[PDB]
Amino acid sequence: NPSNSNLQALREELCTPGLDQGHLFEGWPETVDECNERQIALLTDLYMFSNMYPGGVAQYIRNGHELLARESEEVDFAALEMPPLIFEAPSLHRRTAERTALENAGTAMLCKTVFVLVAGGLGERLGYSSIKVSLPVETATNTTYLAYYLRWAQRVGGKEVPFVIMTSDDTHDRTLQLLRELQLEVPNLHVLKQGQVFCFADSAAHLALDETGKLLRKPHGHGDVHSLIYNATVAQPLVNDWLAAGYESIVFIQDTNAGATITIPISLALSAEHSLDMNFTCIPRVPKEPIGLLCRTKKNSGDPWLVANVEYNVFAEVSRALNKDGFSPFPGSVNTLVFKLSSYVDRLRESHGIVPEFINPKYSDETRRSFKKPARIESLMQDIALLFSEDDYRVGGTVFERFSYQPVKNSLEEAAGLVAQGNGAYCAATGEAAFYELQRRRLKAIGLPLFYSSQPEVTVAKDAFGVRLFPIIVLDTVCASSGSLDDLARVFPTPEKVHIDQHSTLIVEGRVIIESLELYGALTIRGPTDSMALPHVVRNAVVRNAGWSVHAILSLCAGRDSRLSEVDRIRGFVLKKTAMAVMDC
Numbered sequence: 001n002p003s004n005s006n007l008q009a010l011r012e013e014l015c016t017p018g019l020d021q022g023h024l025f026e027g028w029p030e031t032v033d034e035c036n037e038r039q040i041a042l043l044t045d046l047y048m049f050s051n052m053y054p055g056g057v058a059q060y061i062r063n064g065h066e067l068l069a070r071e072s073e074e075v076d077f078a079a080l081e082m083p084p085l086i087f088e089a090p091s092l093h094r095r096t097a098e099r100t101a102l103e104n105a106g107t108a109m110l111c112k113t114v115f116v117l118v119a120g121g122l123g124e125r126l127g128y129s130s131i132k133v134s135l136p137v138e139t140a141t142n143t144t145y146l147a148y149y150l151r152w153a154q155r156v157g158g159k160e161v162p163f164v165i166m167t168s169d170d171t172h173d174r175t176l177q178l179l180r181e182l183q184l185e186v187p188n189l190h191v192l193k194q195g196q197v198f199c200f201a202d203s204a205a206h207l208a209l210d211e212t213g214k215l216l217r218k219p220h221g222h223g224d225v226h227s228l229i230y231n232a233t234v235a236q237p238l239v240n241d242w243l244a245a246g247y248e249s250i251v252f253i254q255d256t257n258a259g260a261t262i263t264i265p266i267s268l269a270l271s272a273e274h275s276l277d278m279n280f281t282c283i284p285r286v287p288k289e290p291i292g293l294l295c296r297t298k299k300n301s302g303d304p305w306l307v308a309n310v311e312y313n314v315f316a317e318v319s320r321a322l323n324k325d326g327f328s329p330f331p332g333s334v335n336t337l338v339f340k341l342s343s344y345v346d347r348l349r350e351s352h353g354i355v356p357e358f359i360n361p362k363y364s365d366e367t368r369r370s371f372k373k374p375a376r377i378e379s380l381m382q383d384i385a386l387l388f389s390e391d392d393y394r395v396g397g398t399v400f401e402r403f404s405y406q407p408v409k410n411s412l413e414e415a416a417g418l419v420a421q422g423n424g425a426y427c428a429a430t431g432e433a434a435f436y437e438l439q440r441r442r443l444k445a446i447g448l449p450l451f452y453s454s455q456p457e458v459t460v461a462k463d464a465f466g467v468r469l470f471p472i473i474v475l476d477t478v479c480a481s482s483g484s485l486d487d488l489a490r491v492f493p494t495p496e497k498v499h500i501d502q503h504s505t506l507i508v509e510g511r512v513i514i515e516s517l518e519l520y521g522a523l524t525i526r527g528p529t530d531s532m533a534l535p536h537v538v539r540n541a542v543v544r545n546a547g548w549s550v551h552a553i554l555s556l557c558a559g560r561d562s563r564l565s566e567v568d569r570i571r572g573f574v575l576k577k578t579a580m581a582v583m584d585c
């Protein structure tokens with residue numbers, strides 16, 4: 001595509017004052033023909049960048065200057081207060097008329113919802129060498145985050161549910177491999193891969209090179225998802241196809257928060273009840289948390305009010321700098337974003353999916369402009385909220401219980417550090433434990449009589465903290481459908497006759513109704529995979545066996561001839577699946 005002539009032009013352009021990328025061409029021949037393969041190839045990806053980024057490498061460099069300049073000054077907003085449109089979600093564990101009404105309205109709206117999963121990130125912190133969505137939500141069934149989201153979306157939206165996954169060079173091939181291995185058949189799935197952007201070796205925005213002498217690249221953030229969608233087709237633009245098909249909402253989720261399946265229906269219901277074009281999923285924030293804050297903002301004294309997320313790392317500078325004339329003053333945003341499709345599309349087309357950018361260089365010294373590592377420009381998918389003026393649109397937030405936010409983000413080591421400071425662990429152990437506890441709270445909400453200790457059953461991270469797992473109850477999507485309280489009531493139509501001991505394990509797959517059961521041990525019950533089949537009904541069942549246990553992974557573990565995997569080690573315990581009764585048919 002790129003002619004040898006065009007390449008020389010770009011080379012010369014990049015050497016001009018204000019771009020100053022002469023260091024890339026040190027020791028090069030005057031003209032292209034004279035240049036070799038290595039050289040001609042470097043000039044190429046510089047050139048091709050145009051097709052990946054607005055205004056190519058030249059504009060990228062200019063944006064860097066503008067950002068690096070802005071990044072020296074203290075952030076400040078003329079005004080900062082509570083967003084006008086904030087709404088409290090009813091508890092997920094109380095079956096009130098309101099909760100019922102909202103779940104019913106929301107669950108119906110799921111039939112007309114487009115789903116989007118951002119799964120391009122590496123999650124540096126974890127100490128898991130594979131992709132985040134390949135993590136199990138829990139080790140009872142080992143269902144991956146990927147499968148969990150997809151089966152749920154196909155359940156509430158039908159097999160043909162529109163679904164977008166954003167990958168990156170870091171996650172893409174493994175994502176496709178996982179889809180293939182799980183034998184997930186998702187007809188309207190679109191996998192969209194974000195491209196990498198160049199890096200700056202310094203505050204003057206000189207491009208960094210790697211060891212071999214090639215242009216160093218890094219991801220541009222979860223912000224890329226909007227442009228990826230804008231430019232995606234199916235002949236016809238993707239979003240057009242969705243609109244023409246009758247879809248009315250679009251939802252964005254992140255890679256390791258199982259809570260989203262619970263919050264989303266509620267949000268949809270509230271978005272429609274309160275006519276919200278954009279609806280931020282929130283929780284009460286603890287002053288220290290690495291989650292952003294939902295605020296009403298005016299950056300300068302003359303600007304309009306803008307409802308938008310302010311990231312945690314920024315709310316620090318703004319904190320002390322801006323004021324004069326148990327939780328954070330403003331809601332914490334968990335980045336489950338709920339949009340009215342038509343409103344979303346309008347702003348998308350206006351901006352070409354392009355959202356405001358930033359840069360957050362890491363310095364090697366206190367106050368030397370020297371970079372410890374090359375920096376690149378970033379973007380946040382939630383910053384699309386900046387394109388929604390208060391005049392034309394209604395942006396707001398829905399506040400849920402903190403318990404419904406269950407990310408898996410920190411390693412065991414970090415988690416011990418956080419917990420010693422009294423902060424949330426948000427690690428694999430607490431993620432799995434939170435999942436089990438969520439099923440239990442939901443089930444008790446429909447009257448299932450679960451009695452169980454609140455004491456931890458295992459300690460992790462060198463006696464730092466403990467979690468409990470039991471009793472373990474996991475119902476698959478065929479069994480539990482959307483997971484609404486009404487849907488759970490269908491599995492247990494007479495919950496007072498179902499007695500699950502605190503040490504028990506109940507796994508249910510397919511079309512199953514449990515009327516009466518006494519369980520002291522582990523039990524798997526399987527019904528027809530076909531959701532429209534005659535359900536396997538369980539009455540007067542009595543099951544007793546050794547069941548399962550959990551124990552900690554000990555420091556004195558050889559790791560040799562041990563089937564202990566990273567998945568085990570990052571949570572610090574292992575389930576022992578000693579006995580299991582199985583009821584089929």
Ligand SMILES: O=c1ccn([C@@H]2O[C@H](COP(=O)(O)OP(=O)(O)O[C@H]3O[C@H](CO)[C@@H](O)[C@H](O)[C@H]3O)[C@@H](O)[C@H]2O)c(=O)[nH]1
Pocket residue numbers: 118119120121122123132166167168194219220221222253254255256290291292293309311332333334335380407409
């Ligand atoms: O280049 C990227 C970077 C990230 N991601 C994904 O984006 C999501 C969010 O990434 P994560 O690294 O977990 O957290 P932060 O980006 O630090 O923060 C976000 O997530 C928080 C809650 O988990 C919110 O409170 C913040 O405001 C929101 O910016 C994940 O699913 C990642 O896979 C990509 O797809 N491409």
